[PDB]
Structure 1
Amino acid sequence: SWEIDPKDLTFLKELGTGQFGVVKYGKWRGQYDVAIKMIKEGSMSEDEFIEEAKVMMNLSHEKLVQLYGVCTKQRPIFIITEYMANGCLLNYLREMRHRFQTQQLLEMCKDVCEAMEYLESKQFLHRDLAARNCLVNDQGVVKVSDFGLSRYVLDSKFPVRWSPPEVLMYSKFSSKSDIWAFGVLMWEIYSLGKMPYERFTNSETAEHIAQGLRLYRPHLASEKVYTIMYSCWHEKADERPTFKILLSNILDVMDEE
């Protein structure tokens, strides 16, 4: 049920290339738009990824980048997922031609928050939530991509700038580390793709965070939006809200402004 016949695929255009592999745009069975992620050899723990791909099949939500299947009878293995015509959210934010309204930015945050509240309702962690791991479709809808994928990367590259103090100190991952990452993601949305702690190294950022210091308010963020994103960064993990509470807060702010 999780396996796709690679012969059902037609490759139309290359979307990206990196140490993770090559991503191409294509069609499934002649008409269905798909993204084909060809995994670089030796880059991933492939047996484990195949086992958990079946679990990822049942994760279905309108704001999750949907997994259609995997091709594992050949090398490189393929991950067949939803096609998102406007690509990476980070690059999308950095394109200044869009002249974004803060209303569109809050809508982006709400998209991501709905996806994350669904994942939380399934007790599934993303473990690498960030704008570089979000995608934008032709309608402008933002969806969460590559959830749980870092568990199978075989590997300086750790997302220090998206990590709470307990992760940086003792590697304690939980739903609250996803919450912290979501706060940093709202920051980078309202900063139009700016790098968190842009004038700091990863080491300086870790020291900054352990000292209790935080990011501060992006210019496009109102007081209520900043309050929402700042609430994700409480030093005590259990004092950080849930994604359901964050969704309520964002909906309230959308109604207010």
Structure 2
Amino acid sequence: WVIDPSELTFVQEIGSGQFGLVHLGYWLNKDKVAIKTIREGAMSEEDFIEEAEVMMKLSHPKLVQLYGVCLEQAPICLVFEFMEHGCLSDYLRTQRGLFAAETLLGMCLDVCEGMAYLEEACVIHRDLAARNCLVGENQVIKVSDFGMTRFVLDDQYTSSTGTKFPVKWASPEVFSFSRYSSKSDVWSFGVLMWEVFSEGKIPYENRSNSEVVEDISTGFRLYKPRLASTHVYQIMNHCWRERPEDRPAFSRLLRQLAEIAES
């Protein structure tokens, strides 16, 4: 799991993150990769290093793989499977008007399959959203960054009341108590479905985080996107049930969505 600095080459930048830059590069005797450099203080590096081998075993074709860690010198680097077409959020926004509902549903099915694998492995994503779903070969969507918020040291991102907390994708028990579970990931997956079927619109765009908490708590839900059928919107609403117990498991969503896609 440890990669030496001599085993990596940086070719060009891919883009920035809140905690570090991502580069396109090569990994010796392996493949082209994405390399993240992490600024000092952003991550609990020791916690991550303890968990790296464990994360690397979560190998599924619909999950963006962690290949290893270059830790010889600061800044430490994380090495990932390269996803050629980038973030799903920008992929949808820059191609509005192109995709048929069958293709948008297929994108949701790829994400659901990766999430069903994590759910079976008892691994919680914690921050599922279109921004961390990545587009690869043959337009496959893969989920990235599962469990990564466990290592973020900036309390503005991790505290349910933090200014950078992803309240718009959070179930009520997460925005209230940080009570994470695969059922809270299902709520986030419903928001992700809305981002996909809306072709990358921002959910609750004109609401503050405090307003989203009050709106959700009083029964408000995102409107149906034009491209979503009434059956797809019914499934979105099941993900947004107030009680986690009433939400479908990813194993149930995968069958329900596949039934629509395969019909």
Deviation, structure 1 residue 229: 1.3
Deviation, structure 1 residue 90: 0.5
1:209 to 198, 212, 216: 216
Q: State the AA in 2 paired with 1:182.
A: F
SS at match of 2:224: coil
CA contact (8 A) 2:239 2:248 kept: yes
Deviation, structure 1 residue 40: 1.3
- 1:182 is the counterpart of 2:181: no
Distance 2:262 2:234 in 1: 16
> Larger deviation: 121-130 or 91-100?
91-100
What TM-score results when the alignment is normalised by the length of structure 2? 0.94
Aligned to 1:167: 174
CA contact (8 A) 1:20 1:40 kept: yes
Q: State the AA in 1 paired with 2:34.
A: A
Aligned counterparts, 1:106-117, within 5 A: 106-117=105-116
What TM-score results when the alignment is normalised by the length of structure 1? 0.96
Q: Once the two structures are aligned, what percentage of the paired residues are identical?
A: 57
CA contact (8 A) 1:9 1:30 kept: no
SS at match of 1:125: coil
Distance 2:135 2:51 in 1: 25
Aligned counterparts, 1:1-257, within 5 A: 2-29=1-28, 32-96=31-95, 99-155=98-154, 156-256=163-263
Distance 2:81 2:258 in 1: 26
Deviation, structure 1 residue 139: 2.1
Deviation, structure 1 residue 138: 3.5
CA contact (8 A) 1:63 1:143 kept: yes
Deviation, structure 1 residue 214: 1.0
Distance 1:97 1:251 in 2: 24
Distance 1:146 1:214 in 2: 26
CA contact (8 A) 1:19 1:40 kept: no
Which aligned runs of 4 or more in structure 1 are off by greater than 4 angstroms? none
Distance 2:174 2:223 in 1: 21
Q: Any gaps of 5 or more consecutive residues in structure 1?
A: none
Deviation, structure 1 residue 87: 0.7
* CA root-mean-square deviation: 1.2
Deviation, structure 1 residue 171: 2.2
Q: Any gaps of 5 or more consecutive residues in structure 2?
A: 155-162
CA contact (8 A) 1:179 1:232 kept: yes
Deviation, structure 1 residue 19: 2.6
Deviation, structure 1 residue 12: 1.1
CA contact (8 A) 2:128 2:189 kept: yes
Distance 1:76 1:140 in 2: 32
How many corresponding residue pairs?
A: 255
Deviation, structure 1 residue 18: 3.3
Deviation, structure 1 residue 6: 1.9
CA contact (8 A) 1:164 1:177 kept: yes
Aligned to 2:158: none
